[PDB]
Design an enzyme around this catalytic site. Structure first.
Site, PDB file in Angstrom:
ATOM      1  N   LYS A   1      56.361  40.072  31.362  1.00 49.87           N
ATOM      2  CA  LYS A   1      55.855  39.746  32.582  1.00 49.87           C
ATOM      3  C   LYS A   1      55.623  40.649  33.399  1.00 49.87           C
ATOM      4  CE  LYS A   1      57.739  36.580  34.701  1.00 49.87           C
ATOM      5  NZ  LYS A   1      58.812  35.187  35.400  1.00 49.87           N
TER       6      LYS A   1
ATOM      7  N   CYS B   1      45.103  45.640  42.206  1.00 48.56           N
ATOM      8  CA  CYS B   1      43.644  45.029  40.957  1.00 48.56           C
ATOM      9  C   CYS B   1      44.293  43.352  40.690  1.00 48.56           C
ATOM     10  CB  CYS B   1      44.369  45.805  39.942  1.00 48.56           C
ATOM     11  SG  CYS B   1      43.143  45.786  37.983  1.00 48.56           S
TER      12      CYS B   1
ATOM     13  N   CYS C   1      42.040  42.690  38.016  1.00 46.00           N
ATOM     14  CA  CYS C   1      40.789  42.462  36.341  1.00 46.00           C
ATOM     15  C   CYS C   1      41.888  43.090  35.609  1.00 46.00           C
ATOM     16  CB  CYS C   1      40.018  42.836  36.689  1.00 46.00           C
ATOM     17  SG  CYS C   1      39.930  45.122  36.369  1.00 46.00           S
TER      18      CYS C   1
ATOM     19  N   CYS D   1      43.602  48.602  43.149  1.00 44.81           N
ATOM     20  CA  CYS D   1      42.451  48.253  42.587  1.00 44.81           C
ATOM     21  C   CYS D   1      41.891  50.168  42.171  1.00 44.81           C
ATOM     22  CB  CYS D   1      41.238  47.807  43.565  1.00 44.81           C
ATOM     23  SG  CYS D   1      39.637  47.048  42.789  1.00 44.81           S
TER      24      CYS D   1
ATOM     25  N   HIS E   1      36.950  47.035  37.797  1.00 43.21           N
ATOM     26  CA  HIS E   1      36.014  45.709  37.603  1.00 43.21           C
ATOM     27  C   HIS E   1      34.933  45.425  37.643  1.00 43.21           C
ATOM     28  CE1 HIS E   1      36.590  46.391  42.054  1.00 43.21           C
ATOM     29  NE2 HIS E   1      35.175  46.189  42.229  1.00 43.21           N
TER      30      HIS E   1
HETATM   31  S1  FES Z   1      40.450  44.314  40.899  1.00 45.23           S
HETATM   32 FE1  FES Z   1      41.073  45.406  38.761  1.00 45.23          FE
HETATM   33  S2  FES Z   1      39.919  47.255  39.353  1.00 45.23           S
HETATM   34 FE2  FES Z   1      38.970  46.274  40.877  1.00 45.23          FE
END
Ligand code: FES
Ligand code: FES
EC number: 2.6.1.3
Lengths: 66, 76
Positions: B22, B40, B42, B51, B55
């Site tokens: 996790k 990030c 994503c 990030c 995304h």
């Molecule tokens: S939210 Fe994942 S690279 Fe931007």
């Protein structure tokens, strides 16, 4: 390829949250990275059900004082 | 090579730290490590947990609408 977010604020073409820690009274915030929380952008533990249902290993981002 | 992937199609993180059951990150609220961070959400960034703009391609390829979490740290 599958979407990550299934249901949250789908009328927003890209969901971004921005917070300034100066504004907070609390010593800790726990933010969702799984897009399954019912309190998004905050974590409510929904990641555990997601991880079990799909075999994944995702979890939240915590901002906290020592 | 394989041209079929029998993993659950609903999995969010495809590749990051799969030996960790996790993945949780915890950072200081105060500006001990940075003044501001863009995190990030994503699981496609090559700089996870930060990030790197991945995304954008994810949203284009899948029709999704995910994006990062921006945190301005408390200045001490
Ligand atoms: S939210 Fe994942 S690279 Fe931007
Ligand atoms: S509910 Fe999504 S990371 Fe915990």
């Amino acid at each position: 390829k599958a979407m990550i977010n299934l249901h949250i604020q789908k009328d927003n073409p890209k969901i971004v949250h921005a917070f300034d820690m100066e504004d907070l009274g609390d010593a800790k915030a726990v933010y969702c990275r799984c897009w399954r929380s019912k309190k998004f952008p905050f974590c409510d533990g929904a990641h555990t059900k997601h991880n079990e249902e799909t075999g994944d290993n995702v979890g939240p981002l915590i901002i906290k004082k020592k």
